[PDB]
Amino acid sequence: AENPYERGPAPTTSSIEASRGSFATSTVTVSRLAVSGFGGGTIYYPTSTTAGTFGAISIAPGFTALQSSIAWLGPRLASQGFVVFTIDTLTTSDQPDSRGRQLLAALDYLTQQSSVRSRIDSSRLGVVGHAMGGGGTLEAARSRPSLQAAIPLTGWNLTKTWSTVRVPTLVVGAQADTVAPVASHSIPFYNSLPSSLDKAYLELRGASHFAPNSSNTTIAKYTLSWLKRFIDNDTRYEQFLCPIPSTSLSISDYRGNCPHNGXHHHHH
């Protein structure tokens, strides 16, 4: 294809909302004892060897949480054409800066040492995270500007200013979140990102802090579209991001610049 990184069939509303994409997937377990730098995890990967190499992401949980809290993202994203590494942290009490470093240590294990490293294009990587792990994605993106995408889900971080981030970032907030309220976390994060950066804010209507821990089609479709657009440079997914979505039962607020790779809109 024109885009060497394009994978899978042309997307539709149905395909980006489905619980699975078109790629068969498998898993590998990485034990705590096999790695240094992070708490092990689970690799979800496309099994096909005829489609080319894939981009990859690491995903981190929040304070006290285990990888089971984010596991549903594994098959859901991997089956759309990504290697997805859901990790445990060294301790459940690790703070956002530590989670950020562990996201990066996990990506380096994935691309340099893991059993699927040959299936990955190590130049096309991203980070996703929930809660303090979402705070970790901003920490990781700030440190590693070569990342292609960063997605904090209901993120928590005492640092509110992210004006040096150069990684395209989708900030996902939960409107009713009382643990990491959007007014003091997600929205400040989004507002402090550079005006020149490809970025978006997605607010889940009436959602709690725990919405990212259960199957959620709105989180899935926009996470997928963002990862496709920026890890794969896949302009077939631009249609779902630009013009920005209108508010709905699932979406209470959306902000972002359009078009990508080139003005800011906001729907409330």
Residue 14 engages Cl ion in binding (rule: CB under 5 A): yes
Residue 169 engages Mg ion in binding (rule: CB under 5 A): no
Q: What is the DSSP string of 101-127?
A: HHHHHHHHHHHHTSTTGGGEEEEEEEE
Breaks (C-N over 2.5 A) in the chain follow: 262
Query: Please, are residues 150 and 127 in contact by the beta-carbon 8 Å criterion?
Result: yes
> CA–CA separation, 251 vs 54, rounded Å?
30
Cα end-to-end span (Å), the chain: 38
In the complex, least distance from residue 230 CB atom to Mg ion, rounded to whole angstroms = 5
Question: Using the rule CB under 5 A, which residue among 53, 58, 86, 114 binds Cl ion?
Answer: 114
In the complex with Mg ion, the residue whose CB is nearer, 98 or 148, is 148
Residue 148 engages Mg ion in binding (rule: CB under 5 A): yes
Picked from Cl ion, Mg ion, none, the partner binding residue 208 (CB below 5 to 8 A depending on kind) is Cl ion
Residue 164 engages Cl ion in binding (rule: CB under 5 A): no
Residue 178 engages Cl ion in binding (rule: CB under 5 A): yes
The contact mask relative to Mg ion for 91-130 (x = CB under 5 A, - = no) is ----------------------------------------
Residue 12 engages Cl ion in binding (rule: CB under 5 A): yes
Query: Please, are residues 88 and 59 in contact by the beta-carbon 8 Å criterion?
Result: no
Picked from Cl ion, Mg ion, none, the partner binding residue 72 (CB below 5 to 8 A depending on kind) is none
In the complex, least distance from residue 209 CB atom to Cl ion, rounded to whole angstroms = 4
Sign of the alpha-carbon dihedral angle for 237, 239, 244, 249: negative
Question: Using the rule CB under 5 A, which residue among 146, 164, 215, 247 binds Cl ion?
Answer: 146
> CA–CA separation, 202 vs 96, rounded Å?
21
Residue 248 engages Cl ion in binding (rule: CB under 5 A): yes
Other C-beta atoms lying within 10 Å of the C-beta of residue 139 = 30
Interface residue list for Mg ion (CB under 5 A):
148, 230, 233
